[PDB]
Design a protein around this ligand. Structure first.
Ligand SMILES: CC(=O)N[C@@H]1[C@@H](O)[C@H](O[C@@H]2O[C@H](CO[C@]3(C(=O)O)C[C@H](O)[C@@H](NC(C)=O)[C@H]([C@H](O)[C@H](O)CO)O3)[C@H](O)[C@H](O)[C@H]2O)[C@@H](CO)O[C@H]1O
Ligand SMILES: CC(=O)N[C@@H]1[C@@H](O)[C@H](O[C@@H]2O[C@H](CO[C@]3(C(=O)O)C[C@H](O)[C@@H](NC(C)=O)[C@H]([C@H](O)[C@H](O)CO)O3)[C@H](O)[C@H](O)[C@H]2O)[C@@H](CO)O[C@H]1O
Ligand SMILES: CC(=O)N[C@@H]1[C@@H](O)[C@H](O[C@@H]2O[C@H](CO[C@]3(C(=O)O)C[C@H](O)[C@@H](NC(C)=O)[C@H]([C@H](O)[C@H](O)CO)O3)[C@H](O)[C@H](O)[C@H]2O)[C@@H](CO)O[C@H]1O
Ligand SMILES: *[C@@H]1O[C@H](CO)[C@@H](O)[C@H](O)[C@H]1NC(C)=O
Ligand SMILES: *[C@@H]1O[C@H](CO)[C@@H](O)[C@H](O)[C@H]1NC(C)=O
Ligand SMILES: *[C@@H]1O[C@H](CO)[C@@H](O)[C@H](O)[C@H]1NC(C)=O
Ligand SMILES: *[C@@H]1O[C@H](CO)[C@@H](O)[C@H](O)[C@H]1NC(C)=O
Ligand SMILES: *[C@@H]1O[C@H](CO)[C@@H](O)[C@H](O)[C@H]1NC(C)=O
Ligand SMILES: *[C@@H]1O[C@H](CO)[C@@H](O)[C@H](O)[C@H]1NC(C)=O
Ligand SMILES: *[C@@H]1O[C@H](CO)[C@@H](O)[C@H](O)[C@H]1NC(C)=O
Lengths: 323, 170, 323, 174, 319, 171
């Protein structure tokens, strides 16, 4: 009569590495490395992202005719641009603190577009129609940003304008405006009459004075002139005052918003899908059950640490010796 | 290797035993076959599952948007940003690799240890009522039937019961 | 006759975690997690911090009437503000490079307040008394910053101002000044006579030409005008020059200082004491014996690494089995 | 138990033995009592204290003011700074916890190894003059008084001086 | 007859430390801490650094007379006493940014963007000199810039454009002079109230003279601000002015390279290859840790303040 | 140690065995001498090598410049940069020290284990045919020439062959 003591053995072909020797076949093992995704841009923590499609943040936040602007509604966990989002500033110029605006719009809850300065009743002393250009075409015809209005002289006079807005909303209000720079003195007078002008914008915290800068610059989108875009956040109980004698692209639409901690912007072709994840990647969403991940180094959310490893499987069973 | 049992004085594994990590192969008057030891197998399953869960769960992760956009006049802090991501990358990659290496070795030592202790355990029950024949096998000096094997496995082997019979056949 | 081998067991109820099993009662153990502070703001390296009371750095360094400028220590390891410290720039405006200044003052080994442009002898052809305002009220009367002087026209005239200071101090000299911006052209003339004025400040390293920017901005502390604050560190041997035809809020007091590389600014209600530490936290100091702490991630000095652990109990004895 | 001693073939510890970690419990014609192996217990203390000091003293930290201040237009660098602090947090938190888990396991294995080694040291001396009755106990085949028992504890047991008496008692029970 | 089991021992004196015990003498051990360096500044990628000697990047890029200064460099080296930079006092806008982006290039070509011979028919190009920028005792000026000045009491508005026909980026640098007095303003540029305007498809900025008497630096009461920008291939850059403009003469066709750095040190350059560069010398090791210097350029071991990291490979040595 | 052999019941090392890491020392009426166990020794070297290479090869760092230049008004991001370098410093310093300490213990334990498994392997072959005279030495209760000595080093020792002869030598 015999009684033997032994251990398990199976058809398992799983291999692991130990500090002592490599490629050891064991009975059972588990992968510590998450190396798969869903190739989709999912909703982060329940909240979907804001896909700008063929537009970039600039073109979207401004009224670029090609941009849909959406709008219904309201909040998002992050923003998505496509590698071919070329529709932004249809009129050449500088966009001051642009990266900051994008960063601060990465994740906003409660986002409400409103007509801070109603078009029909705001500017009775200035022309709010001639302010169009071929640089921002819409359906063949000349057009302009939907959120800004390009004021010009009414007839033969540009009266000093002074408009003001008090934040009646219960949140921060993002305000955007532009300063135009004609290419020639001829265009200045033909545009604003005054020749020597100034623009002034200030609140309780913000305060800047703008002077037109006239010169012929290299043609961009067939425009020799330039147009700079500025922006600020007006606190809940604060007042912002605009003042100008010309060269001002007054605001028409502003934005009420409650900015979150701050996420990021993914620039990818990866399609947006109806899925839920706690970790997002430009290539797609991954699970957060494993502590490590080699899908992509640039993630958004509570993600597994990024490593260069190709495999990280932990031996659970014992050395497989079927023999 | 570290304990001499697995790939040691017990050269191979049992494809036959398919219900547990460690167990026995009996062969007596009324047949033979394989049968896993439930106490030590379940105990190990609970401890290796805990090990795995520890390396996984202990990983606390803060909500982070790794991505950052810097313009053409912000190269210095862009590269600074690059140094942070790479720094973390090299830290986590090196640590993750050494962890799997190190803990895999222990896991194997842990199984080897369990097989060792199991062998030692049965040896204590049998004393000299059986003979060590190598390869992690015992040969009973008495008639050990099914109910006998069953008592050896569950540690409740009645030594003084078969003590007499065994001393005889020598 | 028997001899038994055994191990120790006691009344210990301490439990530790192992990779294999949770809550294993052991006979002896030590804690690696520092989880207690002393609820005190202490001296760091033997040097007390600088507590600005109800004032912030802007209010303290400018000379806000509500802030102590007389008995400020000649050194400090770090600065402490309180969450509600509101007394800063009593006259509304922009404090340029403010955070950088705060940072660069975070630690100092030598600090001497001295009259750079003595009020009695520095401005014979300008009015150095009428420069007061209800925005910065003192003992029941209009007033102004103690470390600056708001020069106004003497009589009906404001001659060209030009004054320089050579740093003969053995160290760097911090120099602040202001540029006042009236809300109207009338106030411009009422203050400085001249309508089209300029200000010029420049050292061997610094240089900037300021120009009054006049407009009616939202009222802050009852002021429609603005006052911008600037500063720079004049190195030993170098000179700084002031030139103006108006709107110049002149320096009266400057600060000789030797900066101590680094340090920070704690903002807490936690009281200060005559205690000595090597690791300070916004809610109390901690002992730097243990390697890990879970009190607060934001610390100053040689501190244990911060962790989200609630317990890091390390077994030293063996498993306890008394039965 | 990696070495199968503690909570292994020695089921429980001794509340009776209060002067050491590892020790003995003798019983003979002169009564019984608890005793602690001072040498092995001392070495264990020294090595464990050196293990605690290593985990603690190897942590040499730079002087650092973690706090940073950024304005409303420095959100990116503020988040960069945040990512750096969060990075160290997740790195240190994870390393601390596992360092505790894994070392805790080794410490328990350590004591276990010590108990096993002590058992094999006694068995090695007794050889045939004693019997292994389990539970980490040895039953002598001869009459082991207090002097004899003490010589086992300090590793000076004279096997030959009891061999003859042991053989007679041995073969009878065998 | 006997059979004994034992282990090796030798004349080894090497010690290692274990969590349980210190100074444990063993038979065999390997080292993990690199503590050696050749004390030389070597080539990264097999390419030599750009050593600037007594000049800094500003003086080299602007063409300071004391800098007569390859078409490629893996990194840049300045000495702790590289003083010859901007010989005319003023601000160098985005200076640290420019240094960072010139730290390493795969291609670098200086070319006369605005030929001094024909570019300025209505302005003087031979009076723009100063004792602040001496060359062999006599007044001189930056070799890459031209200090345009009025001719015959007249400074007409100038307009000059350059279309980048190089197959890469063009580094254009220019300056804005600020007289100390109105008399110098008129004496130099005549017009008194002047402007400078530069714009491409990206860049755009308007400059104004800030006339004032500032402290003498290198005996100059006036000032000169230095500006630069990268012109994309195919893009045009334009200069417009009525005075105060120090026009570009030599620009740089270049291709920037990833992320290198700058080393300031006296350590001598040497013709050797390395993969990890340190201000004190080079490091060539396969070891994972190093205690030579925290600030390194290349693919280097991680820095620690350990002084001994010895791995035991053999067993405890017991003679 | 952890396995009782080295610095344990086998109190000292053998300089006579310059042959390898582990081995034997025999003495019969033929002769005597030190002989290292090639099998065990080789495996140790092979595995200890992999260990050393694992700690090293697994580094593989990224190309980094590290040095950064900030002006007099960038003290904040300069101190942020220093915090990064120092953080990495404290991390790699601590983890490097601990690694060497923990693995040095593991390595010594490894060698101890190897010796033990070598000693027990012989102990389990002889059983009664020999006694354990301490210091990891086995005194045969019977004559064991070379053809017998080489047998035990192969684990092919024949117990029964010498069983009866050993029986008598135990008075
Ligand atoms: C004041 C004016 O009309 N200026 C004339 C120049 O526009 C013109 O130069 C040509 O301008 C072309 C574009 O014409 C528009 C446009 O962008 O579509 C026509 C728009 O109605 C006009 N918008 C407004 C609100 O006035 C717009 C505007 O003048 C500029 O954006 C001002 O910067 O210009 C196109 O760019 C051609 O390439 C360019 O030659 C010259 C010569 O025709 O006459 C000017 O009087
Ligand atoms: C000198 C004076 O009284 N000027 C009149 C203005 O004050 C007045 O506008 C009113 O300004 C009010 C604030 O009054 C002070 C102030 O304390 O802030 C009074 C100070 O004496 C004066 N300081 C100096 C050095 O002149 C100061 C100063 O004028 C302003 O700060 C300049 O910006 O103003 C308060 O804000 C009222 O709301 C406002 O109407 C105008 C119009 O009434 O007349 C001025 O003569
Ligand atoms: C326009 C002019 O000639 N201005 C005269 C001042 O230069 C002069 O003040 C003295 O200037 C001295 C330096 O003289 C140079 C120089 O920098 O070397 C001589 C150069 O020829 C001249 N360059 C040009 C293109 O004109 C240069 C230039 O004027 C300044 O750099 C402009 O800022 O000046 C030196 O700095 C002395 O310390 C200083 O007193 C005064 C008095 O002699 O007369 C002005 O007409
Ligand atoms: C939109 O993008 C396309 C492709 O880049 C471009 O050609 C077009 O001009 C853009 N339209 C507007 C008005 O922005
Ligand atoms: C354990 O024993 C000690 C020693 O007398 C005693 O002081 C302590 O109260 C006991 N532990 C507990 C918490 O009961
Ligand atoms: C002990 O174990 C329990 C259950 O596994 C766990 O919830 C607890 O966190 C552990 N220790 C304690 C009391 O924190
Ligand atoms: C306070 O303690 C620290 C170290 O804990 C020491 O550097 C300092 O000298 C002490 N204070 C004084 C003034 O001795
Ligand atoms: C001081 O702070 C209080 C609010 O706490 C404020 O009402 C007062 O105006 C401040 N004084 C000055 C001069 O800033
Ligand atoms: C070159 O540097 C030296 C001092 O290092 C200085 O004396 C000399 O004026 C400089 N030359 C120029 C033109 O910068
Ligand atoms: C450095 O490497 C290059 C090839 O990349 C080679 O041409 C050169 O000889 C090497 N330099 C030295 C001194 O080895």
């Amino acid at each position: 009569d015999t009684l033997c003591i032994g251990y398990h053995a199976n058809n398992s072909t799983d291999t692991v590495d130990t500090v002592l020797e490599k490629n050891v076949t064991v009975t059972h093992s588990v992968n510590l490395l998450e190396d798969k995704h869903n190739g989709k841009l999912c909703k982060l923590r329940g909240v979907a992202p804001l896909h700008l499609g063929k537009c970039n943040i600039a073109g979207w936040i401004l009224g670029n005719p090609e941009c849909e602007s959406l709008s219904t509604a309201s909040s998002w966990s992050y923003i998505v641009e496509t590698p071919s989002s070329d529709n932004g500033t249809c009129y050449p110029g500088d966009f001051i603190d642009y990266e900051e605006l994008r960063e601060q719009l990465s994740s906003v809850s409660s986002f409400e577009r409103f007509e801070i300065f109603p078009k029909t009743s705001s500017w009775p002393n200035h022309d709010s129609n001639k302010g169009v250009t071929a640089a921002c075409p819409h359906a063949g015809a000349k057009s302009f940003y939907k959120n800004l209005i390009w004021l010009v002289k009414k007839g033969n006079s540009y009266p000093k304008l002074s408009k003001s807005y008090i934040n009646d909303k219960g949140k921060e209000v993002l305000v955007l405006w532009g300063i135009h720079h004609p290419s020639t003195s001829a265009d200045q007078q033909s545009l604003y009459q005054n020749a020597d002008t100034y623009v002034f914008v200030c609140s309780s915290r913000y305060s800047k004075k703008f002077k037109p800068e006239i010169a012929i610059c290299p043609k961009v989108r067939d425009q020799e002139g330039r147009m700079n875009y500025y922006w600020t956040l007006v606190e809940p109980g604060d007042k912002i005052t605009f003042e100008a004698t010309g060269n001002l692209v007054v605001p028409r639409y502003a934005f009420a918003m409650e900015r979150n901690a701050g996420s990021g912007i993914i620039i990818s072709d990866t399609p947006v899908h109806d899925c839920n994840t706690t970790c997002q990647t430009p290539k797609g969403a991954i699970n957060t059950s494993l502590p490590f991940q080699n899908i992509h180094p640039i993630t958004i959310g509570k993600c597994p640490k990024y490593v260069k490893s190709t495999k990280l499987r932990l031996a659970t069973g014992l050395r497989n010796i079927p023999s | 290797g570290l304990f001499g049992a697995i790939a040691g004085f017990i050269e191979g594994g049992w494809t036959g035993m398919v219900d547990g990590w460690y167990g026995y192969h009996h062969q007596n008057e009324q047949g033979s076959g394989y049968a896993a030891d439930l106490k030590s197998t379940q105990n190990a399953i609970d401890e290796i599952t805990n090990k795995v869960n520890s390396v996984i769960e202990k990983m606390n992760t803060q909500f982070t948007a790794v991505g950052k956009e810097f313009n053409h006049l912000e190269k210095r802090i862009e590269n600074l940003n690059k140094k942070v991501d790479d720094g973390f990358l090299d830290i986590w990659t090196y640590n993750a690799e050494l962890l799997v290496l190190l803990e895999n070795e222990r896991t194997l030592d842990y199984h080897d240890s369990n097989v060792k202790n199991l062998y030692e355990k049965v040896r204590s029950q049998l004393k000299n009522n059986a003979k060590e024949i190598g390869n992690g096998c015992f040969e009973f000096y008495h008639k050990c039937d099914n109910t006998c094997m069953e008592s050896v496995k569950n540690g409740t082997y009645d030594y003084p019961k078969y003590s007499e019979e065994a001393k005889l056949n020598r």
